[PDB]
Design a protein around this ligand. Structure first.
Ligand SMILES: OC[C@H]1O[C@@](CO)(O[C@H]2O[C@H](CO)[C@@H](O)[C@H](O)[C@H]2O)[C@@H](O)[C@@H]1O
Ligand SMILES: OC[C@H]1O[C@@](CO)(O[C@H]2O[C@H](CO)[C@@H](O)[C@H](O)[C@H]2O)[C@@H](O)[C@@H]1O
Ligand SMILES: [Mg+2]
Length: 580
DNA sequence: GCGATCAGCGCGT
DNA sequence: TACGTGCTGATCGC
């Protein structure tokens, strides 16, 4: 049966009660400078639908939106807040965000709409968004009557579900995680996305020309060495050329055919000159297609800025993700790709990019959680952790640690964190399975606390059904009891890794909140631009660098207090690249 | 035939 | 061995 509501042609006092479920609908997936297709309000007085051009033009409604004392319950308030920021309207008073609540309760449900969250509490008097707007090419805003009922039903569900969701969060001891961490962070992420990052499109364009020329040369050389032209970017076609025409050895297969990944090509290089050329071609193409063209496609021509959207309710560990563009995977390891960062510059003249990153936060967190004596002492001495791990598992003095030993000790660390999986380890160190397990065994002997932790955490996951982070974020691990070795093992690794990655996410998130409070207190113009898992990127007047050098590291290091210190390195410069 | 999906790949922490 | 976004191609399905 249809849901009753007033489709108002004008705003009234009733719609401005001090508490309500609010819906400011933005259908475009990328909400930056996007249109708001309709508004719905549900409160003590009833249910209302307002046309955007009407409500947003009304002084009272706008004032109500920005009144922090007028409490609103919503779903994905960040989306609404940013869309409104582009319209010069401030949204305040959001005291409950159903999307974030559902996310904290169970990241695995993939809740991405009101209907999905509501289904968790057996509430189904609301339709999934996809059912209303369609999917992909056929996506479209329906006529007003259909639009209004949907928005009103969503607002109604939020109004009804607020209490049940908050009660379960309290029971999970996650209420403060929502109210004091994720919701305040949501507002900070909205300012970050709205501010955007300025881009030197001319530099990017020039790089594009050079890459295009280099790709041309290499592409011809490749056909020359192959004796024919073919689609190099086709693992299928390239496979026939390498393994059939040139007879190269098949070291690995893919469910669909021959493997041609970089790791495989590396081993094949000695056999034929075409291999190094394909590898080189892959490097250039990655830069050209994914980064140069990728960035130039989303830069706003008017401001030359890119406005990423941080998905705050997606990852199973509590990390954020970045889209359109993804600014969390910009090249840095290889010097050629690193050059791309020279294209990200300050948004104002005489301003600079400042970057601060936690040094080894995952292992410091592990030392804390496992309370491993050797590991805690290592960080208390601020030792090079990889060299120290090498010394321990290879039983040698610091002067006896060779470059290769340290490299493998690093791999073990990079691994211990992701759950002991000799297969993944052996694959990375290009060694055997047993050998990979042998290192692991040596590591636990040097760090018995870590071993006890890994055992205890897995048992705890089995007993409770989930694992938790420092700030009470949780992840359910149903496969922990699976009788399938592989499925169960993966779940055990997740049991081991989630508390580490998840707790590191909690910390930097708290740091962002703390940092913004300090910046405001100090009246600095510096502001956050990006977060990349364990590092924060800001821009500010050149005159604020010295103060930032002391303040940013301190706030990040003092976000939480662990059994070991937290260390933050920092750098600043004229471009993101120079912030090294 | 063409949009939607899958397959393989490589970039980041 | 963890967690993501999203490219070009190949294959799926209306
Ligand atoms: O607005 C971000 C918020 O919306 C969800 C769906 O409720 O994701 C949508 O927006 C993202 C950014 O444009 C897209 O990547 C995604 O495909 C689209 O469904 C949530 O996942 C997210 O928290
Ligand atoms: O020149 C375009 C034409 O060349 C082929 C090979 O016959 O593909 C080449 O060019 C593409 C565009 O950059 C690359 O993606 C591909 O790797 C390279 O071999 C044809 O597929 C294409 O129609
Ligand atoms: Mg770091």
């Amino acid at each position: 049966a249809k849901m009753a509501f007033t489709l108002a042609d004008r705003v009234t006092e009733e719609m401005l009660a001090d508490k309500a479920a609010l819906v400011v609908e933005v259908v475009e997936e990328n909400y930056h400078d996007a249109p708001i297709v309709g508004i719905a309000v549900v409160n003590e007085h009833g249910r209302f639908f307002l046309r955007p051009e009407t409500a947003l033009a009304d002084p009272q409604f706008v004032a109500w939106l920005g009144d922090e004392t007028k409490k609103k319950s919503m779903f994905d308030s960040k989306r609404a807040a940013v869309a409104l920021k582009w319209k010069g309207i401030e949204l305040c008073g959001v005291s409950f965000d159903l999307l974030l609540a559902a996310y904290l309760l169970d990241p695995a449900q993939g809740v991405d709409d009101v209907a999905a969250a509501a289904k968790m509490k057996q509430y189904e008097a609301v339709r999934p968004d996809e059912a209303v707007y369609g999917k992909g090419a056929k996506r479209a805003v329906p006529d007003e009557p259909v639009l209004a009922e949907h928005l009103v039903r969503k607002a109604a569900a939020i109004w009804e579900l607020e209490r049940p969701f908050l009660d379960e969060l309290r029971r999970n001891e996650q209420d403060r995680l929502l109210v004091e961490l994720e919701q305040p962070l949501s507002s900070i992420l909205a300012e970050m996305e709205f501010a955007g990052v300025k881009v030197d499109t001319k530099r990017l364009e020039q790089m594009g020309k050079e890459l295009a020329e280099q790709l041309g040369t290499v592409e011809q050389r490749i056909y020359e060495l192959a004796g024919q032209e073919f689609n190099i970017n086709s693992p299928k076609q390239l496979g026939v050329i390498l393994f059939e025409k040139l007879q190269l050895p098949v070291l690995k297969k893919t469910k669909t055919g021959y493997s041609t990944s970089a790791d495989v090509l590396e081993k094949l290089a000695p056999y034929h000159e075409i291999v190094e050329n394909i590898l080189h071609y892959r490097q250039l193409g990655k830069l050209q297609s994914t980064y140069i063209e990728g960035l130039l496609k989303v830069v706003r021509p008017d401001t030359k800025k890119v406005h990423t959207i941080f998905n705050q309710a997606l990852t199973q560990t509590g990390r954020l993700s970045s889209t359109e563009p993804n600014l969390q995977n910009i090249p840095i390891r290889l010097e050629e790709g690193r050059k791309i960062r020279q294209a990200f510059v300050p948004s104002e003249s005489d301003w600079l990019i400042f970057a601060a990153d936690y040094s080894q936060i995952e292992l410091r967190v592990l030392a804390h959680i496992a309370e491993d004596d050797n590991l805690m002492e290592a960080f208390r001495r601020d030792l090079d952790i990889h060299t120290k791990t090498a010394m321990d598992i290879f039983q040698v003095s610091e002067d006896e640690v060779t470059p290769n030993m340290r490299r493998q000790a690093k791999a073990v660390n990079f691994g211990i964190v992701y759950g002991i999986s000799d297969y993944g380890l052996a694959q990375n160190l290009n060694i055997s399975r047993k050998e990979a397990a042998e290192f692991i065994e040596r590591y636990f002997e040097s760090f018995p606390g870590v071993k006890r932790y890994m055992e205890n955490i897995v048992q705890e996951a089995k007993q409770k059904g989930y694992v938790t982070t420092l700030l009470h974020r949780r992840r359910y691990l149903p496969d922990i009891t699976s009788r399938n070795f592989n499925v169960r093992s993966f779940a055990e690794r997740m049991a081991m890794n989630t508390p580490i990655q998840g707790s590191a996410a909690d910390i930097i998130k708290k740091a962002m909140i703390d940092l913004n409070a300090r910046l405001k207190e100090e009246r600095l113009q510096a502001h956050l631009l990006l977060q990349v898992h364990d590092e924060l990127i800001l821009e500010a007047p050149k005159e604020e660098m010295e103060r930032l050098c002391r303040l940013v590291p301190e706030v990040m290091e003092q976000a939480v207090t662990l059994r070991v210190p937290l260390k933050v390195d920092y750098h600043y410069g004229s471009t993101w690249y120079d912030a090294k």
